[PDB]
Amino acid sequence: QSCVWYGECGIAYGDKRYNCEYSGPPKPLPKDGYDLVQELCPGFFFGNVSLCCDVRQLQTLKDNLQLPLQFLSRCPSCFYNLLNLFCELTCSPRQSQFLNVTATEDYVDPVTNQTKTNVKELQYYVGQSFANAMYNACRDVEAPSSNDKALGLLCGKDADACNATNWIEYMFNKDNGQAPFTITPVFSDFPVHGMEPMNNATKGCDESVDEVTAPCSCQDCSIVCGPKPQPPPPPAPWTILGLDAMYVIMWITYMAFLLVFFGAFFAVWCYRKPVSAAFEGCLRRLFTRWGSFCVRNPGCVIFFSLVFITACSSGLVFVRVTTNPVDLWSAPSSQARLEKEYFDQHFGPFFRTEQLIIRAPLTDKHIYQPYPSGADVPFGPPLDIQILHQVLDLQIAIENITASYDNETVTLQDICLAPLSPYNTNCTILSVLNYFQNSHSVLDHKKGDDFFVYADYHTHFLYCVRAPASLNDTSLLHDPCLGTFGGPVFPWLVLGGYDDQNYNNATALVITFPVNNYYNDTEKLQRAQAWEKEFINFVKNYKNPNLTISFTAERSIEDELNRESDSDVFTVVISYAIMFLYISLALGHVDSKVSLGIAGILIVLSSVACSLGVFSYIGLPLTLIVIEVIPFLVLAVGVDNIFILVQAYQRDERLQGETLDQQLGRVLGEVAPSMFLSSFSETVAFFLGALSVMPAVHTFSLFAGLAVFIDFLLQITCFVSLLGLDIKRQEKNRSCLFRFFKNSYSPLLLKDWMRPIVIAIFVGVLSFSIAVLNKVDIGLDQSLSMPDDSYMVDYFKSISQYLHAGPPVYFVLEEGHDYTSSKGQNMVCGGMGCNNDSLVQQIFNAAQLDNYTRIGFAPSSWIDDYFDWVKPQSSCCRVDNITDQFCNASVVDPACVRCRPLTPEGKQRPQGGDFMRFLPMFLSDNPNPKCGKGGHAAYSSAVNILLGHGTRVGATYFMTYHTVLQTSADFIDALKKARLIASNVTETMGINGSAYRVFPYSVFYVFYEQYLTIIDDTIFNLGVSLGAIFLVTMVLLGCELWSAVIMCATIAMVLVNMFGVMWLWGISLNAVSLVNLVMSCGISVEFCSHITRAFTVSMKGSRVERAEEALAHMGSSVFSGITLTKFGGIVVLAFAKSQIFQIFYFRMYLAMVLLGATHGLIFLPVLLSYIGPSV
Ligand SMILES: *[C@@H]1O[C@H](CO)[C@@H](O[C@@H]2O[C@H](CO)[C@@H](O)[C@H](O[C@H]3O[C@H](CO)[C@@H](O)[C@H](O)[C@@H]3O)[C@H]2NC(C)=O)[C@H](O)[C@H]1NC(C)=O
Ligand SMILES: *[C@@H]1O[C@H](CO)[C@@H](O[C@@H]2O[C@H](CO)[C@@H](O[C@@H]3O[C@H](CO)[C@@H](O)[C@H](O)[C@@H]3O)[C@H](O)[C@H]2NC(C)=O)[C@H](O)[C@H]1NC(C)=O
Ligand SMILES: *[C@@H]1O[C@H](CO)[C@@H](O[C@H]2O[C@H](CO)[C@@H](O)[C@H](O)[C@H]2NC(C)=O)[C@H](O)[C@H]1NC(C)=O
Ligand SMILES: *[C@@H]1O[C@H](CO)[C@@H](O[C@H]2O[C@H](CO)[C@@H](O)[C@H](O)[C@H]2NC(C)=O)[C@H](O)[C@H]1NC(C)=O
Ligand SMILES: CC(C)CCC[C@@H](C)[C@H]1CC[C@H]2[C@@H]3CC=C4C[C@@H](O)CC[C@]4(C)[C@H]3CC[C@]12C
Ligand SMILES: CC(C)CCC[C@@H](C)[C@H]1CC[C@H]2[C@@H]3CC=C4C[C@@H](O)CC[C@]4(C)[C@H]3CC[C@]12C
Ligand SMILES: *[C@@H]1O[C@H](CO)[C@@H](O)[C@H](O)[C@H]1NC(C)=O
Ligand SMILES: *[C@@H]1O[C@H](CO)[C@@H](O)[C@H](O)[C@H]1NC(C)=O
Ligand SMILES: *[C@@H]1O[C@H](CO)[C@@H](O)[C@H](O)[C@H]1NC(C)=O
Ligand SMILES: *[C@@H]1O[C@H](CO)[C@@H](O)[C@H](O)[C@H]1NC(C)=O
Ligand SMILES: *[C@@H]1O[C@H](CO)[C@@H](O)[C@H](O)[C@H]1NC(C)=O
Ligand SMILES: *[C@@H]1O[C@H](CO)[C@@H](O)[C@H](O)[C@H]1NC(C)=O
Ligand SMILES: *[C@@H]1O[C@H](CO)[C@@H](O)[C@H](O)[C@H]1NC(C)=O
Ligand SMILES: *[C@@H]1O[C@H](CO)[C@@H](O)[C@H](O)[C@H]1NC(C)=O
Ligand SMILES: *[C@@H]1O[C@H](CO)[C@@H](O)[C@H](O)[C@H]1NC(C)=O
């Protein structure tokens, strides 16, 4: 056997040369084009080659394969068979078996006068199962900038009826203009004329060609791609018989309660036919004696108390204020905080983002019609050419801003981040104008002639939203849309308002300005914030009636909070003014107590300032929010104690010749145990609520506890002396409620029929509260912490309404992994031979779910890219022969050799020291137009290399994006499921011990890690505070366990009803809701204590009469003392300016006050009447 048509001497036209005829033996290859044999069909290299082939023939094949390579190279198993059909067809060693030249003519040589016979025509025998396996396996390849089949672009006609036999005929036909001579294919599967066609092994778009080349994608093949994944949605509601299954357990219980209760009443109604006294007695004596002492030594007492106030409150000179949200809302040692500490150290902190959500309301969508052919494509309003010009103008102007600072200018070019610098230094700007490179000329330049435009910016947009990483349009335009900074711009980051793939339909435009964030550096942060201030002002004052901008900045939340935290002290001052007005006129009724009310307010403010100052000395910084919510609470408690004491005296009648000290000592000894119990129960409650892990609640709790305690002490002391002085005064000229409570309310409430109704109603409300308890929301909106008139609220609305991607995620593989071994790479890979449970594959599956696991996009790993780069076929890597230095992809090719040898052993992955030998050059590679993307603009940051000792790799991350996250529920779900993925990877890696582990890092993790344990945090906090209250009460009130248990049960009822009100007004259970509940459990005592003690210490006959006696006596002071004061306070606060107050403090306080009032003054009377301790 032998080949024909050897060499290429003839010429058809242009460069087309008819191959020369030569029917001799197959020519041993010259050892010269060994590389070509490894590129065209490596199936020939088993050296004795004896190939009929010629290198000018190999290179003219390669020249013809440019467009087929461009289309079918997407799926290697396809372009592989196509090659099998051409290499064998041209210079296979048994060419004569399946070939027969027909037409040949002399070719005169202008060099030798020697006639060389050209091959004008011949037939090529192709199997039918071969043409069938080829077309059917390549028929699915889609084209770029379209959703057609690449055969639609390679048949020469519509892709709907290009059969498999005709297309090969057209490919071999010179009628297209590419084939140098037309070949008539014969598709016979059996040897005819003694001529048997070629039938080599064949591979479809599903099977892979080599142990390193992944199969074709289901984008370009329909058979490879199967059933989608699906998670099971568990609601986990019990729903016993149709309803919440908690609505029924309670309704069922309540009916049982009402029957077992009225079935005992209506059942009896027919039946008509040293251990305690020793500690409670020394306190009375001590307090009487001390009150007498303070009443007869007023000068010394008041002077020492003022000296104490100043000595303690002068530490307010060292006051520091914390405004950085991380320190406020993040525990200094939480798991997420430690992960953020680890990420900022090895990869540098996450950058600062300044978004811009532009929208064009004044415009309608328009249609784009392709000239040659194609369905109509509608474009959203903002993708209009005029709107694009105006947005480009806005962006180019946003780049000017300089915002001088510290006597020096600070330009964006200076503060923004440029990944690949100092080679390219423009910087990262993520706008849809980067597809055109921010150029009016590039945006307007058209490539058509009158009556039609060939290409347009519509065409460019459509091509690169499909392929945003190209370096040229390569389709009648030949322009890249990679971006001025170098690196792709993903269409989901620069657009919004479209529908699930149709970036044509985008209704909004997103524009991001990434800025470097610095780790332990303040001049740079000051510089960035100084630029951001001017950016904000500019964007705020830009008019442009054609656009509706929703903007933000990294420093905008902090600015918003410093503006709301100073806009309500103007609120707190009116509150104290109304408190003083009420206190001055109501404290007894020149029967006016204005002088005494002023003294009480000054003692209270003194207590506030003193608390703040002592803790400033200790070093706890102020949150300025506390400094605003603390005064209200302290005023409430102080006014209650003052009124109790002053009124028991006012209501006290003097024995025989008593001057002043004896009466005051007697009144204080009989009133102090109660005031002391209330003050201590609240101090302990508050201090104990200062145990959670949140610096804002921690410090607030501490501050408020100390202020209340110090205020109690200072009041009881300076104020009892000053009360003695003022009582002496006025006795030289220098009740209507009590009648009611005893006269018409106490008797009514305690009748024998009204009591069962009241108890039933209150137990019913408690049952309701227990039923709807577990339906309380969890978390904070993050949009309600802002005023109403702010632009951040609008920005959050715009996000929720338009954006499609969320915050980026980094799956940080900690330091300690190998990376220099087959298995060490398989654990990390998302590739050919490495495992199916690897990190990248697991993140890929998670992204495939995208609703269950809130991870939206593929990992975009660096090791997969590195391997693609190092593969010899790619050829991007190329070293100098003598220097072992990185030869760029654009080089004269003087002496640079390929990095990996092009052999079967070199095809494998670089497992040994070549990995770490070539990795740095990759990470230093730039985006070369001939090579590709390079590994500098995307992975230089993502890979850490330790110098020396073999240059072992450090910590690396694989960053993907979250899905649009709109609510606290969304954020907590994202955190949880990211943790799940990380734990799976950590498990699968099978680490010896816990030397290292994978963990995900996102910006909001520190702010949302508290809601993964907030429920157990609430349980612990509430239980501990209530047990502390219980113990303090059962100790201080004597030793009666019955009174203490009744009071504790009433406060627990109050808390449960607090949770009911939470559910009912839409308050969430965050660390603020939790602080207020743990506080309320401490304020309830202030109500529940007076009534129960007035009941306990009484020696009348029946339970009803004891109840009415306690009600009259103490409740006349309790309704006027605590209720009205706290009510005036809350009604002034109802008009807030910061949202969080007006929602949580106002609602929580109104609920607490009115709930405690009702419980105390009604349910305590009746419950004691029924089951109170006898004596
Ligand atoms: C989201 O974008 C897609 C396309 O990117 C929109 O699909 C197109 O819908 C518009 C609506 O008018 C059609 O103009 C267009 O269909 C055109 O071409 C067909 C081809 O025969 C023609 O018969 C029609 O008359 C029309 O000219 C749609 N494109 C196709 C065929 O896919 C989709 O509607 C967008 N979503 C929204 C909210 O509009
Ligand atoms: C992932 O996100 C959500 C899953 O919660 C899915 O949302 C897609 O589109 C909108 C979202 O607002 C919803 O639309 C659906 O439209 C059809 C129209 O016929 C309607 O019959 C459905 O009842 C539903 O309203 C829907 O949440 C969702 N659509 C579908 C078909 O799921 C999204 O689809 C999810 N991704 C995948 C791949 O399912
Ligand atoms: C077509 O099939 C033939 C089968 O002989 C291939 O020829 C080689 O087959 C093996 C590699 O595929 C070699 O190990 C054999 O040495 C060699 N067989 C012969 C001719 O003796 C041929 O390579 C196939 N086509 C391609 C893709 O090269
Ligand atoms: C971004 O980098 C490009 C080069 O990569 C810089 O060069 C540009 O300079 C002018 C912009 O002011 C344009 O007129 C040039 O066309 C453009 N270079 C090329 C190749 O055309 C440019 O200065 C950088 N920034 C901007 C804003 O373009
Ligand atoms: C417009 C489309 C159809 C063109 C793509 C098909 C082209 C690239 C195919 C069809 C026929 C093929 C040619 C058939 C014959 C020869 C002669 C041989 O000694 C070198 C390869 C060469 C030159 C082939 C190059 C690739 C080729 C030209
Ligand atoms: C209110 C009492 C307990 C004092 C505490 C005041 C401060 C610490 C509270 C009040 C409002 C709160 C903010 C509410 C909203 C947000 C936006 C969110 O994306 C980050 C947390 C952050 C920033 C919270 C941090 C904590 C916060 C600032
Ligand atoms: C090739 O693939 C096509 C795709 O539909 C299929 O119809 C055809 O049967 C396949 N060829 C076979 C099975 O021989
Ligand atoms: C703003 O930018 C324009 C264009 O880059 C430039 O001409 C001008 O000097 C810059 N500064 C201005 C306008 O103050
Ligand atoms: C910067 O400071 C120097 C010295 O204080 C001063 O002379 C100079 O004017 C300042 N820069 C500008 C722009 O004014
Ligand atoms: C895109 O198109 C050209 C072909 O004209 C290609 O060679 C190159 O990769 C890109 N253009 C340039 C000028 O490099
Ligand atoms: C809006 O766009 C038009 C486009 O012609 C322009 O003339 C106008 O100045 C822009 N701003 C407006 C109308 O406020
Ligand atoms: C996954 O793990 C290995 C590698 O593929 C294999 O033993 C197993 O069958 C695979 N199965 C799936 C579903 O990935
Ligand atoms: C490249 O280096 C090899 C290694 O010794 C050497 O044999 C070869 O001659 C060198 N070629 C050139 C062009 O420097
Ligand atoms: C390519 O590498 C050469 C090596 O010296 C360098 O001079 C040139 O600037 C590089 N071009 C790129 C990275 O685009
Ligand atoms: C984590 O892995 C388990 C099996 O080990 C699997 O059941 C679960 O779905 C995985 N979680 C994901 C993929 O979020």
From Swiss-Prot:
Catalytic activity: cholesterol(in) = cholesterol(out)
Stored PROSITE patterns: SSD
Membrane topology type: Multi-pass membrane protein
Lumenal compartment spans: 1-239, 320-568, 616-625, 692-699, 774-1017, 1066-1070, 1136-1143
Site (Important for cholesterol binding): 86
Resulting phenotype, residue 41 to S: Loss of function
Keyword Cytoplasm listed: no
Membrane topology (Cytoplasmic): 647-670, 1039-1044, 1092-1114
Domain comment as written in the entry: A cysteine-rich N-terminal domain and a C-terminal domain containing a di-leucine motif necessary for lysosomal targeting are critical for mobilization of cholesterol from lysosomes.
Record protein name field: NPC intracellular cholesterol transporter 1
Organism per entry: Homo sapiens
Gene: NPC1
